[PDB]
Each structure stands twice: as C-alpha cells, then as structure tokens.
Amino acid sequence: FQSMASMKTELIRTISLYDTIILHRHVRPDPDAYGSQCGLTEILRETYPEKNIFAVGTPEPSLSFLYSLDEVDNETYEGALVIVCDTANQERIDDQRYPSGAKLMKIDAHPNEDPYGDLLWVDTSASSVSEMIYELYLEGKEHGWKLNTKAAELIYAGIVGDTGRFLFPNTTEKTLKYAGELIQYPFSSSELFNQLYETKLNVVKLNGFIFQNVSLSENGAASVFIKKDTLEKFGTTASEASQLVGTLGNISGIRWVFFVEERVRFRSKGPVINGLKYNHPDRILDLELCKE
Ligand SMILES: [Mn+2]
Ligand SMILES: [Mn+2]
C-alpha cells in the first residue's frame, strides 16, 4: 500500500514466525523505553499466549511501577527473534546478548547512524518509539493484534515522556491523535502523571535553592553553581541535581548553564547551544551567545 504499510507488515510477519521473542532498550531507560519495549511486549503477550516473550535489561527504580523485567538464560536466545527499541547505538543497548538470536529487529526514532539489524524500521519523524509501536499495532489489528489496558498505559507513558506531555516540538498530529485513542483505555492518567511527576522533598528544596538564587544579566544570561556544601546541604546526588537544569525554562526574559561537581549541562530558548566546543542544539561564563 504505502511503502510504510509494507515495512510494518514485514515486521508483523517476522514477529508471527518466531516462538521466542526477546525485547531490549537503551541503558539508563526513560519512559519511552519502558513504553516501547514493554508496550510491545505486552501487545505480544496478549496477542500470542503460546509464544515465549521476554523483556530484558536492568530496571530503573523510578520507572518500575510501569512494568517489571525478565531475567533470561543465554540458551533462550537460540533461534529467538530479538527486537530492540529506542536505541540509536549498539554499545548503549541494555543487555548485550542482543545479536545472538536467529534475527535482530531495530525499531527507533533517532537518526540511523548505526544501521544495525536484520530488519529495521527507523523514522525520525516519530515523536517517540512508543508512538511507532502504537502505529505498528494499528497495522497489526488486521493481523489479530490486541491492545489491552496495560499496553495502552505503557505506550501513553512513553509518548508523554518523550514530548514532555505534548510540550516539545517533536509532538506531531499523529502523536496527539494516537494519545486520543490511548486515553479511551481505563487506566488512570491522573495516577500515571502523579507517579511520573513525584519528586522527593530534598530535590524540591534544591530546586527552590536554585530558583531563589538564579541571577539574570540584562541580556537574559543566567547561571547556577551547585557547589560542594550545596549537594550535601540538600543530600542530593549529581544525577538528581543535573536533572533540574530544565526548570529555569519559563523565567521571563531568559535566553543558561548548570555547574555541578561529581559536569555541565546547557540550554537555550533561542541562541543555539551546540556551540559553546568543549570536547541536540567560569570561562564558559562568553555565554552572556545571549549577547547576540
Ligand atoms: Mn529513551
Ligand atoms: Mn525515545
């Protein structure tokens, strides 16, 4: 039909052929990972009870509530179909026995710089891999695929995870229309958002500190150092603090860096940032870019 309709049917055909299917995602998983890898796993469990389907990898603790993962022998990979989602690079795949199956399938929305797999479906126009999986489902409908409540919730969590609940510019028509269909399943989006957005008191306090102390140059320049005492004063990791860099986004008139000792993260509202050089788009403090 649509060169696309053909590609998706080929993945569906291949999935129907193999009795054992093992699914992976990228290390340091995020909602999209859990949405796609596990969204598909759930679709295949419901559609094909007679097969042996497994999702492998190391759990992220804040994401567990979504789904729990399987631990699998080396022997189970023999003759198995392996599907890997949301991972641009083979060296970032979680659980490296990914190419020891009979076949390997790449499903991804990042650029195809590492074109791995026997079968590949890689669209950079998708908002997320979870969205790609809903699409794959739609085509699988004709072929007897079933979406249950669990799977709906997974895919929906992955789409809101990669778009910042329809905030970022990777949101498309398809993203929103698909979201529409998903929320007709009876999972609580409210419970879901509460779980996704839940933040430990100590991190909140930290954010606070940051907000209280941010300063702005007349050219919209802003900077945040989270020195030594600070990370201990608040009892927060490097990982927890660095992850607050995107909380300054709405300050009126901001055009900032971020930082943090273990690290540099940078963000803009205009002036590209793939510039400031120190091997997406206080010496570094040449930032006031904002000048021009
Ligand atoms: Mn991801
Ligand atoms: Mn993704």
Side-chain angles (χ1 to χ4, degrees), residues 2-3 5-70 72-74 76-77 79-91 93-141 143-172 174-183 185-190 192-199 201-213 215-217 219-226 230 232-241 244-254 256-258 261-264 267-271 273 275 277-278 281 285-286 290 292:
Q2 168 91 71
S3 158
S6 295
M7 192 163 302
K8 300 172 276 185
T9 308
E10 292 298 346
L11 312 175
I12 287 153
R13 186 192 47 96
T14 302
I15 290 160
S16 71
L17 289 172
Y18 287 83
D19 300 294
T20 301
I21 304 164
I22 301 157
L23 300 87
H24 302 222
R25 95 263 132 159
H26 70 65
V27 294
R28 285 179 286 155
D30 49 24
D32 193 37
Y34 269 91
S36 61
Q37 174 208 48
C38 295
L40 187 57
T41 293
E42 193 54 29
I43 292 168
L44 305 179
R45 279 169 174 168
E46 181 89 21
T47 309
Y48 304 106
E50 79 286 348
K51 293 178 173 320
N52 301 111
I53 290 106
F54 303 104
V56 306
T58 305
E60 164 44 47
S62 45
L63 295 179
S64 49
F65 71 97
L66 293 171
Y67 213 74
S68 66
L69 312 177
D70 293 299
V72 156
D73 305 321
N74 305 351
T76 303
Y77 270 82
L81 169 63
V82 174
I83 307 188
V84 178
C85 306
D86 198 25
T87 311
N89 311 101
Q90 299 182 69
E91 77 270 23
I93 301 174
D94 201 346
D95 193 335
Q96 292 280 309
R97 323 168 261 167
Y98 69 79
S100 59
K103 288 282 189 206
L104 178 48
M105 176 184 300
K106 188 211 192 156
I107 302 167
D108 200 11
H110 305 82
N112 199 28
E113 287 306 303
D114 180 354
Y116 63 94
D118 295 302
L119 292 76
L120 287 91
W121 182 30
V122 174
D123 185 0
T124 57
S125 71
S127 79
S128 52
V129 188
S130 306
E131 166 179 320
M132 295 173 72
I133 299 307
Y134 185 80
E135 195 173 333
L136 186 55
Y137 160 70
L138 283 182
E139 183 78 51
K141 282 178 68 129
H143 297 82
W145 287 27
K146 293 148 174 167
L147 186 71
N148 65 23
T149 306
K150 194 40 176 175
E153 179 218 13
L154 291 158
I155 291 180
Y156 181 83
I159 280 167
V160 292
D162 266 12
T163 56
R165 191 188 74 252
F166 320 103
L167 174 58
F168 309 125
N170 56 327
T171 313
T172 66
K174 274 182 151 182
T175 325
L176 293 156
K177 293 184 181 162
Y178 284 182
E181 294 186 12
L182 293 165
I183 55 153
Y185 290 79
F187 64 84
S188 168
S189 41
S190 288
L192 174 49
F193 288 121
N194 262 22
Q195 284 161 305
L196 293 159
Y197 291 136
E198 214 182 347
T199 312
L201 187 56
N202 64 293
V203 181
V204 184
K205 296 222 184 276
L206 182 47
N207 211 338
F209 174 72
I210 293 169
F211 279 168
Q212 208 151 6
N213 298 116
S215 68
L216 206 70
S217 48
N219 307 144
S223 63
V224 177
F225 318 77
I226 280 157
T230 299
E232 255 154 50
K233 197 189 139 56
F234 296 98
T236 45
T237 70
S239 187
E240 285 166 319
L244 304 184
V245 59
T247 55
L248 267 86
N250 300 311
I251 291 174
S252 168
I254 211 195
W256 65 93
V257 61
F258 263 31
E261 319 146 339
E262 190 160 40
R263 214 166 213 175
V264 82
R267 305 266 168 132
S268 194
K269 287 309 257 202
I273 223 51
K277 187 184 168 161
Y278 291 84
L285 270 182
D286 282 347
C290 299
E292 323 161 323

